[PDB]
Each structure stands twice: as structure tokens, then as C-alpha cells.
């Protein structure tokens, strides 16, 4: 049971309710929970299935170098960028 973080943006309300089924809606569009890895991939299936032209990034706890991993769906001014195996986030211009 590892920690899970879901950030929703420009997504239809179905996705935010569906994510509110398992995770906690603590802020506008930012979801946090602690579930198993299988359930993490199922909820990621929800993210891929119910979202629209919006963009969502999901970050979960692991035991890698940073102790966490994340995955993105859609397009954002903040795009994940890999630095020699290390996945960081870069801020695109206008």
C-alpha cells in the first residue's frame, strides 16, 4: 500500500467524481490516497478512460531512487522531462 497522488486539470466532472470514489479531494483538482499497485493501475485506467482534452498527472510511492514515480496524460505547460534516467518536470513557455 503506497501513497498515490492525482492532479486533474480541464477534465470532465465524471473523472473527478470517479477519482473521488477512492482518493481524497483535498484541493482543487489534486487527489491523494494510499492504495495497492494493482488498484493504482486500475485508477490509471480510469484516468485514461474518462478524461478529455484536459491533462492529468498521477504520482505514486515506490522504492526507487526518488522514492516516488509519476505518469502523465494529456498536454501541459509543465511537461515531464528525463535527465539521465531521472524524470523531472519542465515549464514550457507560452
Amino acid at each position: 500500500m503506497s501513497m498515490l497522488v492525482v492532479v486533474t486539470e480541464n477534465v470532465p466532472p465524471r473523472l473527478r467524481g470517479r477519482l473521488a470514489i477512492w482518493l481524497l479531494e483535498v484541493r482543487a483538482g489534486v487527489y491523494v490516497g494510499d492504495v495497492s499497485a494493482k488498484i493504482r493501475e486500475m485508477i490509471w485506467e480510469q484516468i485514461a478512460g474518462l478524461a478529455e482534452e484536459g491533462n492529468v498527472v498521477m504520482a505514486w510511492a515506490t522504492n526507487t531512487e526518488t522514492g516516488f514515480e509519476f505518469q502523465t496524460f494529456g498536454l501541459n505547460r509543465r511537461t515531464p522531462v528525463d535527465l539521465d534516467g531521472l524524470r523531472l518536470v519542465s515549464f514550457l513557455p507560452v
Binding site: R14, A20, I21, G33, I39, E45
Partner: protein, 272 residues
């Protein structure tokens, strides 16, 4: 898209909900208060949800509750179970035919009852004895446990009472006991139905629709459940119910009962 529930061990134990209407917003289980403070509830991370007086639940909310497999239990005063609803088709027929098949034979039933006794008190039951006198022995042993643990905690104990009317407004001992045993009944039926077994097929008790829940809860109630309720009765707070629910839920957190309940039930059914 479909709606898959999660494994039962990766879930919060129970949540008590009061004084608000339950609606669905955009596919979410929300508690709506009269003042307008709406409460998002991660319903898919919960094993069982308890409904206190003051709750008004709509049809679609019950539908969403059933589709995520979280058992909802209407509870009233003293936390006693009143009503509950779950999905019907969450059971494998082979398990039900196995349980009822074990219920068909009297001797296999005595085997499983002796299994419950040996798992309950460690010692095997006296051999070649009928069910009713085992019920009397059960009552004597449980009463002795009441006197022993109450004498340990130094709590006012004058016997067990079930109706809250006869309580002298300061009883609080049967309040904590009944609240704890009722919460255990809740998570117990939650696990039994989560695996897909029949809680109506009883072994020690007969006639009542949750006699199986009563037996399974009687197996492991005296390990952690009674003493903490005796602590809440000893310290005597103004609102004991909240402390009993918090305490029992954290006991289920620390002892990790849910994940081990399924092999426990399989082990009990092994004697058949």
C-alpha cells in the same frame, strides 16, 4: 467504463455517517450537510460505512455504494446494527454449496463447532456433547470473562443487559460493549459477504439471519474487542460512543484482522 472494487484488506475499516443527506455528484459519494458543507468521502477505500440517524440516502447513492462493494449499515442508538444493504451477486456458488453442505451434516457441524471452541479458548470441547449444553458452557465462560476482565479494569459490572431502556443513564459499560461488538458484527459481515459466503447459515445460534456473523465474531471478539471497550468504560468520557468507535477501528488497524479473516474462516470451515 466499468467499476472494479478493490481488495478488502486495502481498505479503511468503518465510517459512521450522521446528520446529512447522501447524494452523488459526478460519480462521487458525497455527504451533504444542511449548512451546505459537502463532504467528499473516498468510498472506494472503505470496507464498510455505518449510517447513523440523520442520514438520507438516495437511490443512485445506494447504486454507487453497491457497485464499489462497500457495505452500508444503518446504525442507530448505541451503535447497534439496524439495517444493511450490499450487492447480491458478489458470491461464488461453490462456496455457498460448501457452507450449506457442511450445515447438512450434524456430525460435521459438531466438528466445526469444536473447531470454533478450540480456536476460541485454545482447549478442545468435551467430547460427545450436544449443542445446547455447549451453549450453556459458552454462556458460563463468557460471563466468567465479563467478571474477570471487569475485575481487571475495575469497572462497575452487575451483569449484561441488551435493551438500552433499562440503563440508568450512567451505565456506559453495556454501551461500550455493545458498540464494540456491533462494529465487529459490521466488519465481520463485511468480510463474510466480501468473500461471498452465506451469513444466514448459523452454527451455534439458529433462527437469526446473522448467526454465522455471530459465531465468527464470537471467535475473535475476546482477543482485542472487549478490553478496549472496558477501557473506555473505565475512563468514563462524556461521549463514549465516539471513543469506542475510534478505539475499535484503530484496533482493527493495528491488529490487521481483515487480511487474516479469510484464512480464519477457511480454517473454521476446514473442520467440516
Amino acid at each position: 467504463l466499468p467499476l472494479n472494487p478493490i481488495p478488502l484488506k486495502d481498505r479503511v475499516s468503518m465510517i459512521f455517517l450522521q446528520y446529512g443527506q447522501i447524494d452523488v455528484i459526478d460519480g462521487a459519494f458525497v455527504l451533504i450537510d444542511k449548512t451546505g458543507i459537502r463532504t467528499h468521502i473516498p468510498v472506494g477505500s472503505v470496507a464498510c460505512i455505518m449510517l447513523e440517524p440523520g442520514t438520507r440516502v438516495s437511490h443512485a447513492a445506494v447504486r454507487l455504494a453497491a457497485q464499489v462493494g462497500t457495505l452500508l449499515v444503518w446504525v442507530g442508538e448505541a451503535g447497534v446494527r439496524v439495517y444493511a444493504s450490499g450487492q447480491p451477486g458478489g458470491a461464488r456458488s461453490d462456496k455457498l454449496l460448501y457452507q450449506a453442505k457442511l450445515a447438512l451434516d450434524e456430525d460435521l457441524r459438531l466438528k466445526v463447532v469444536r473447531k470454533m471452541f478450540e480456536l476460541r479458548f485454545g482447549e478442545p470441547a468435551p467430547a460427545r456433547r450436544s449443542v445446547e449444553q455447549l451453549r450453556g458452557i459458552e454462556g458460563s465462560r463468557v460471563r466468567a470473562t465479563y467478571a474477570l476482565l471487569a475485575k481487571q479494569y475495575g469497572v462497575t459490572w452487575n451483569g449484561r443487559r441488551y435493551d438500552p431502556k433499562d440503563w440508568e443513564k450512567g451505565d456506559t459499560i453495556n454501551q461500550c460493549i455493545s458498540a464494540a461488538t456491533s462494529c465487529l458484527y459490521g466488519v465481520t459481515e463485511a468480510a463474510i459477504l466480501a468473500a461471498g459466503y452465506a451469513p444466514a447459515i448459523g452454527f451455534v445460534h439458529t433462527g437469526k439471519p446473522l448467526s454465522f456473523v455471530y459465531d465468527i465474531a464470537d471467535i475473535i471478539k475476546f482477543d482485542t474487542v472487549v478490553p478496549k471497550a472496558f477501557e473506555i468504560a473505565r475512563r468514563n468520557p462524556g461521549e463514549p460512543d465516539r471513543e469506542v468507535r475510534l478505539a475499535c477501528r484503530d484496533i482493527f488497524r493495528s491488529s490487521k484482522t481483515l487480511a487474516k479473516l479469510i484464512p480464519l474462516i477457511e480454517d473454521v470451515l476446514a473442520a467440516g
